[PDB]
Design an enzyme around this catalytic site. Structure first.
Site, short mmCIF file in Angstrom:
data_model
loop_
_atom_site.label_atom_id
_atom_site.label_comp_id
_atom_site.label_asym_id
_atom_site.label_seq_id
_atom_site.Cartn_x
_atom_site.Cartn_y
_atom_site.Cartn_z
N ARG A 77 -3.04 -28.43 44.94
CA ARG A 77 -2.14 -27.12 44.68
C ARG A 77 -0.93 -27.64 44.80
O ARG A 77 -0.14 -27.73 45.93
CB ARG A 77 -2.43 -26.06 45.52
CG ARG A 77 -1.42 -24.83 45.17
CD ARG A 77 -1.56 -24.14 43.99
NE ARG A 77 -2.95 -23.44 43.95
CZ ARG A 77 -3.65 -22.84 42.71
NH1 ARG A 77 -2.80 -22.89 41.43
NH2 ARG A 77 -4.76 -22.38 42.76
N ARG A 102 -8.67 -33.57 36.85
CA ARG A 102 -7.61 -33.19 38.30
C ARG A 102 -8.68 -33.38 39.41
O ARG A 102 -8.18 -33.33 40.49
CB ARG A 102 -7.03 -31.76 38.26
CG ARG A 102 -7.79 -30.34 38.05
CD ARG A 102 -7.15 -29.44 37.92
NE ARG A 102 -7.70 -28.41 37.93
CZ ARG A 102 -7.02 -27.11 38.51
NH1 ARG A 102 -6.00 -27.13 38.94
NH2 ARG A 102 -7.78 -25.95 38.30
N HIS A 167 0.82 -29.52 34.41
CA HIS A 167 1.36 -28.14 35.04
C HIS A 167 2.01 -28.16 36.40
O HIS A 167 1.64 -27.65 37.23
CB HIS A 167 -0.36 -27.77 35.67
CG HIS A 167 -0.64 -26.31 36.09
ND1 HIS A 167 0.32 -25.63 37.13
CD2 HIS A 167 -1.30 -25.48 35.66
CE1 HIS A 167 0.07 -24.30 37.21
NE2 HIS A 167 -0.99 -24.22 36.50
N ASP A 211 3.27 -15.01 33.76
CA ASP A 211 2.54 -15.96 33.17
C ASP A 211 2.45 -15.88 31.57
O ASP A 211 1.74 -15.17 31.10
CB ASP A 211 1.07 -15.76 33.68
CG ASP A 211 -0.23 -17.03 33.38
OD1 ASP A 211 0.59 -17.84 32.89
OD2 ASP A 211 -1.19 -16.81 33.83
N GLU A 270 5.13 -25.90 32.31
CA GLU A 270 4.11 -26.97 32.13
C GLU A 270 4.34 -27.19 30.69
O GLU A 270 4.70 -26.53 29.87
CB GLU A 270 3.01 -25.99 32.10
CG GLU A 270 3.02 -25.22 33.59
CD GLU A 270 1.49 -24.25 33.66
OE1 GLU A 270 0.76 -24.59 32.88
OE2 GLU A 270 1.54 -23.36 34.59
#
Length: 297
Positions: A77, A102, A167, A211, A270
């Protein structure tokens, strides 16, 4: 962020690769740590995941969660998650968001350095394990340049069509005053039923959970931070979209790999290729790149 990042740079050197590059280990994960006169940066081999970047004379630029696990196969994270070969929620039942690259160990294939900073190339390849859930062969390269600025370039070799993102989590003084400009006009608001909105000035604020997928952003997004007195320029290449995200407080509380107040000190801006799929052949590999630059304010 500064606390967790300081933990990494306090770790014992397991192998000295070069005078500025070492391998270290935190819990399960092998880390590559750049401690150079002009820049400090660190990566996990897992996800070729850039965890932190601090050019000399500046505060940490990337945010990293003080509550993230460092566990085999578990997404980290913070930093710059490489989201490949899909961006966002999986089409298939039970698959994670943001692909599988990832979650897997990448090799550090190459690197060089000079008085200005360091370049590194990480590689991920398909295997019998990956082919089990994604039946396509591939070689994915992540090339980084860490110095006064930070360059990230993702390149996928194979025959397939994908969506992807870099990201990035950017360290900010206080999200409540952050605005990001250069975001263009139309956007998809994922918080609000994927409704399409239109900015008239390309400027986004983050008063709560935000978002958004920008459909027509400019090459350079600019994060304005009055608290740390700086702007961060996030330059996008070969992309289709930019995503701006901050989870706000409720989500920050329920996410176990985040501090309850984590949302206060980051914004995600991002580099994204999501609203159509990207071609890789064959051989014209796909590419997605982000460059980060810090300036006083």
């Amino acid at each position: 962020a500064s606390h967790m990042i300081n933990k990494i740079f306090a770790l014992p050197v397991i192998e000295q690769l070069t005078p500025v590059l070492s391998r270290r280990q935190l819990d399960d994960l092998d880390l590559i740590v750049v401690d150079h006169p002009q820049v400090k940066a660190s990566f996990a081999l897992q996800g070729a995941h850039l965890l932190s970047w601090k050019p000399v004379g500046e505060e940490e630029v990337l945010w990293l969660s003080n509550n993230t696990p460092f566990k085999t196969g578990v997404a980290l994270r913070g930093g710059v998650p490489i989201c490949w070969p899909w961006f966002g929620p999986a089409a298939q039942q039970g698959l994670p968001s943001h692909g599988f690259a990832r979650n897997l160990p990448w090799a550090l294939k190459a690197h060089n350095e000079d008085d200005n900073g360091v370049m590194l190339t990480f590689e991920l390849q398909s295997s019998e394990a990956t082919r089990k859930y994604w039946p396509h062969d591939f070689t994915l390269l992540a090339r980084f340049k860490v110095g006064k600025t930070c360059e990230i370039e993702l390149e996928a070799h194979g025959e397939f069509a994908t969506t992807s993102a870099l990201h990035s989590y950017f360290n900010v003084g206080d999200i409540a005053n952050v605005k990001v400009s250069g975001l263009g006009d139309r956007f998809i608001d994922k918080v609000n039923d994927a409704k399409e909105g239109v900015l008239t000035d390309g400027i986004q604020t983050f008063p709560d959970r935000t978002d958004r997928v920008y459909l027509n952003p400019e090459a350079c997004s600019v994060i304005h931070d009055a608290t740390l007195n700086r702007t961060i320029d996030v330059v996008h290449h070969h992309h289709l979209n930019v995503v701006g995200w901050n989870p706000g407080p409720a989500l920050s509380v329920s996410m176990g790999d985040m501090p309850d107040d984590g949302y206060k000190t980051f914004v995600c801006v991002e580099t994204v290729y999501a609203t159509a799929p990207q071609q890789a052949t064959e051989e014209k590999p796909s590419r997605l790149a982000q460059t980060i630059c810090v300036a006083k304010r």
